């Protein structure tokens, strides 16, 4: 029925050693300007250095979380060169019941919306109690919100024009 | 009376079955399709005997 | 290692693959940091390859077990072949037919 937005990283704090902002591209275009979404984050490296990332969060709001993320891959060999230094590269997701380690690929393809770059996009619901952690060498886009969501059933999607 | 009683087919063994948390979608088409021929035979069956 | 089957029915085996969440406990157990196992027949075939990565611990233990089933048929056999991380089967089944069983939960 409803829910509650909360931030689980915020923005300054989580994220010391990479580049928080120049995370943005013109295919995601807002009031003409370049943007991106709302609730996740693009990273890249302060400076031509990557550290190897890791970072936990627990929940303690007594009902369930639904976490999203995304795992970018650029189509060319130089373009993840320059984004990340690092030619071999992984993510990885770790909870109770839900585990992945995540690969990225590179090949040529053709331009959708003048990008020849993808992202795939996941999403995990958490229980309370159980904790949930990112640890990533080239591509993470982390969540910057989530969502806590209550009960209340028997609803659905209408497409009409009433 | 007898004619009613053998035009009424007995059931044989159903065991209802298992999903994961990434199968809702399947398990819901389930609980559609049981609950559905469930009404049907107790509304045929009041109707039957109500004529 | 290789097996074949006589008993002119099925058989269904398992096996799991193991992975440990560190490098080192990788390093201690198979002295390989690179591994696979893999699993041959004529219908089911496969390579595995372990994953290393931290999580938290579940009764008292932070790394996990993939587990694996397959049926054989009557005749064809099938073939393990592992350079780190088999649980390799030590007991198996032949089974019968006869349907129209199931599975009950209740108390009584």
């Known amino acids: 029925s409803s829910f509650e937005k909360f931030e689980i990283f915020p923005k300054a704090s989580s994220w010391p050693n990479h580049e928080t902002t120049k995370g943005v591209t013109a295919a995601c275009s807002y009031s003409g300007a370049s943007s991106f979404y709302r609730n996740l984050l693009w990273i890249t490296k302060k400076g031509t250095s990557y550290p190897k990332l890791s970072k936990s969060y627990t929940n303690n709001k007594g009902k369930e979380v639904l976490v999203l993320w995304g795992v970018h891959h650029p189509p060319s060999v130089s373009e993840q060169q320059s984004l990340y230094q690092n030619a071999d590269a992984y993510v990885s997701v770790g909870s109770s019941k839900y585990n992945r380690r995540f690969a990225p690929e590179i090949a040529a393809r053709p331009k959708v919306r003048g990008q020849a770059g993808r992202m795939n996009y996941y999403w995990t619901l958490l229980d309370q109690g159980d904790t949930i952690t990112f640890e990533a060498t080239g591509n993470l886009i982390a969540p910057w919100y989530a969502f806590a969501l209550n009960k209340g059933s028997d609803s659905g999607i209408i497409t009409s024009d009433a | ?51």
Do not use: H
Request: aromatic share 10%; net charge negative; charged share 25%.
């Open chain 2, 1 to 51: 009376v007898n004619s009613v009683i053998e035009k009424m087919n007995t059931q044989f063994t159903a065991v209802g079955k298992e999903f994961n948390n990434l199968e809702r979608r399947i398990e819901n088409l389930n609980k559609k399709v049981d609950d559905g021929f469930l009404d049907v035979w107790t509304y045929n069956a009041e109707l039957l005997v109500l004529l």
